[PDB]
Nucleic acid binder design. Structure first.
Lengths: 63, 110, 25
RNA sequence: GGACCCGGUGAAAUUGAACUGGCCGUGAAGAUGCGGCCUACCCGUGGCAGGACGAAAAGACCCCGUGGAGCUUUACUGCAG
RNA sequence: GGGGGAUGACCCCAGGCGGUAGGGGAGCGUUCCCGAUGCCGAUGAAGGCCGACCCGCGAGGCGGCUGGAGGUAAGGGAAGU
RNA sequence: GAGCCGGUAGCGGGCGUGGAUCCCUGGAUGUCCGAAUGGGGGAACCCGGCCGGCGGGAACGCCGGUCACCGCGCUUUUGCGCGGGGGGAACCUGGGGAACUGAAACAUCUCAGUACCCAGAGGAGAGGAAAGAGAAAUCGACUCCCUGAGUAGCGGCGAGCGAAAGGGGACCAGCCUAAACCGUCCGGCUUGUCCGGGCGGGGUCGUGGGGCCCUCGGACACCGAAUCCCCAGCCUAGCCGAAGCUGUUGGGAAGCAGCGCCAGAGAGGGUGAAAGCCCCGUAGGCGAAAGGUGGGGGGAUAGGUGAGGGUACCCGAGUACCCCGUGGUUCGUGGAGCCAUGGGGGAAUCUGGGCGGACCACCGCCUAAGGCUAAGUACUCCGGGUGACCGAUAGCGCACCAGUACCGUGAGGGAAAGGUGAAAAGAACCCCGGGAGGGGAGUGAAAUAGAGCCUGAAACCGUGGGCUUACAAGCAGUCACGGCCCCGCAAGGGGUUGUGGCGUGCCUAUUGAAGCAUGAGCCGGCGACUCACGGUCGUGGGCGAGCUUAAGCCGUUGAGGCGGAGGCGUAGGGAAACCGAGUCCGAACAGGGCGCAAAGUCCGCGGCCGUGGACCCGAAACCGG
């Protein structure tokens, strides 16, 4: 039987039929960061390769 | 009785007469052919195998017990000397003169 | 009768019959 | 009084295996077994301890495992009272 | 790899081929389940004992002696090998 | 159905077809312990009342029978008559209830409500006609299997834990009582109208019960039992039961040969070496009882409920509901409910009162705060069946004078050891010798089959023979050349070595090893990358929409075949609303995801990945009894 860090599955996660997977930018923001603006324009989505294998897998099945 | 060993279980552990079941057989032409129902046991016959094969003799002792019987004829002598009746391998056993001079013998088998 | 088989037997025997293989409908 | 010679009995740890010499050199840096050399017949028993890194025991002294177990206080938390 | 392979195989030359973790391919015997229109053996099942034919091989075959009863599968399957 | 006094084969004696041995069932005895229970006690022993013969009581008095513990009802009277308790491998619910270990620490968490202990029910308990579930105004007992779903979701959101309604399936199934209303009374207070307990009314299934007034209406509706025989199934033995003989190599044949039969029963096993036909009480197939336990099923027992409107109304509970403190639940303090309760307040009897997850309006559901209820799932001590299950170091450890020998005070541990043969025919007699044991004879197919006596290998100790050995180094040895010795695979090889020639053993861990680093004395057998559910790529192949749960039926062999809840692909993009081959950011045509079909899917077989004790043994320790 199987499941998955359901977690990460929650937060950051979720694949495209492409056989690939992505999670929201993830620079700094949402903690400390009076910082700047344009930097703001720094949160869309970041797709890390290689590892996204543990991931995907470990999730595998439903997502 | 549907397995190998349940044969020792309803033959010798059960009714010893079940071993009678063993004294089963036939014999000469007469009697036989005539049928085969209603025995005698300590009757006469003449084996049909073992060196002694094709021999002439009679039924001496219903040994069911030992699992077979003895045939005066069929026998042997020791080494000290004296003669003696050998063991009768139930197996090769023949009976034609169906012991029945005894009205009760003729009222069962022949 | 299983001796009417000895029949419809002698009808067509051989070795393949060897095989054989009953079955009605 | 053993040990030694007789007769009777008759174990035991360790050990890959082995007919196992000294040298001066060497190799993983303290070699009977590798090189050169010198002495060198085959076996034994009564002994004498040096070497076989001899035996005993997978160091207790050491460090390493985000091992364990006991006592301590202004260590953390929690319970008993 | 490449020049034609009929199923073999045969010819050239290129071209290496030392290899532990470790990666890929190919084979060997071990006890069992088939008996894919399969059965040997009292003039020996099998194990044993001994060998200057067959294979790169792990094994085969086969012949001589032993011993009392078994079991072999030409082929695929299975596993306490 | 004709043999026997059990495994004892041996001596000595005996019962038996005017139905013995033994197979069955119901008996009567059942010495002492053990809940023990008459009383005591270091169990298996020692003590007491009543009856008892009366008994040797030769001119002198005893065992036997018996009897009685204590907690339970209650005909209470002075209490007479019923139940219990002790077991029991495994399985069941309640009562109580833990660390390891994972999280690569560890306090939350996990292992778990597991392991253990306790109590107790049963042959099954568990549970069980709904103040339930959820929301299509849809569903309805409880249980269990598949599925839902590893989803919704819980969380130092980390390791992990991880529901349910709904759909498919097995089964079906329903009933009661306080429930003061009515009347009956019985006992009290003290006469009224109070509480009381036995009788009925009703004694609620899905809201009704009474009490009143008119319509009523005037026979098929059996449960968890109750009942009768019924097929009562089994209970061990029930019994028939197809069909060959000659010849032959053989110590033995059932083999090799010649002719012959069976047949719904060629399932195997025993038979002197392998039979359908020799034995088999077997499968063919029919058989079978006076006693012990069912459904099916037949009947009455049937116990038992079973229609109409109206009325101001009184009648399933002592605590619902609320505050705090825990539980279970997927919920780990949370926006956090339902049900269950530890303490404290302490409502209502049908416009009543909980519920549909804080609460509130409205809608929708349900009617508690007592009880009984077979069947559908679990478990093997027992008996059977079957084996790609074992073969004496494997299997339960234990294949038969083993949970016994033996160490342990104890709790507890806990072994080894099977095999002659066709049957004893098991070695009379003679020999050396105190014997054991060895030499002959005899059984015999063979005893180098010979009494722990089948096969009986190695290691290891012997007896002879070939070769070889005293100025010689290395485990090894292997290449050359020589002499002796034998040539059942001869002009080629066997064996042994005298010399010389080149040579550092073998395993783990190591930068590196002969080793002086460890591993091993020698031989034989056991002994270490497995299985399951998932997922993951590769491949062998069946349809491209592919594919099957659980179950229903069919089953010497037992033959699969139907089952369409589901689940992965059929677009995806997004937190979502939602849009959609387009979409999210945004107010901009600048990018992210995707479109572009390339399409899987089931299965088989594999290299792997997660959960698993999971490549195999290894410690110090923690936790329970």
């Amino acid at each position: 039987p199987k499941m998955k860090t359901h977690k990460m599955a929650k937060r950051r996660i979720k694949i495209t039929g492409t056989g690939k997977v992505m999670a929201f930018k993830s620079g700094k923001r949402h903690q400390n960061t009076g910082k700047s603006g344009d930097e703001i324009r720094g949160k869309g989505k970041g797709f890390v390769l290689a590892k996204a294998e543990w991931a995907r897998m470990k999730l595998m099945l439903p997502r | 009785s549907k397995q190998p060993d349940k044969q020792r279980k309803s033959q010798r552990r059960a009714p010893l007469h079940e071993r009678h079941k063993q004294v089963r057989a036939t014999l000469s032409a007469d009697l036989r052919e005539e049928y085969g129902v209603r025995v005698n046991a300590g009757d006469t016959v003449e084996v049909l195998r073992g060196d002694f094969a094709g021999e002439e003799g009679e039924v001496i002792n219903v040994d069911l017990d030992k699992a077979v019987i003895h045939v005066e004829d069929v026998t042997l002598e020791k080494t000290d000397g004296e003669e003696v009746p050998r063991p009768l391998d139930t197996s090769n056993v023949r009976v034609t003169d169906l012991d029945l001079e005894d009205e009760k013998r003729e009222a069962r088998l022949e | 009768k299983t001796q009417e088989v000895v029949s419809l037997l002698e009808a067509l025997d051989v070795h393949a019959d060897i095989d054989r293989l009953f079955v009605t409908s």
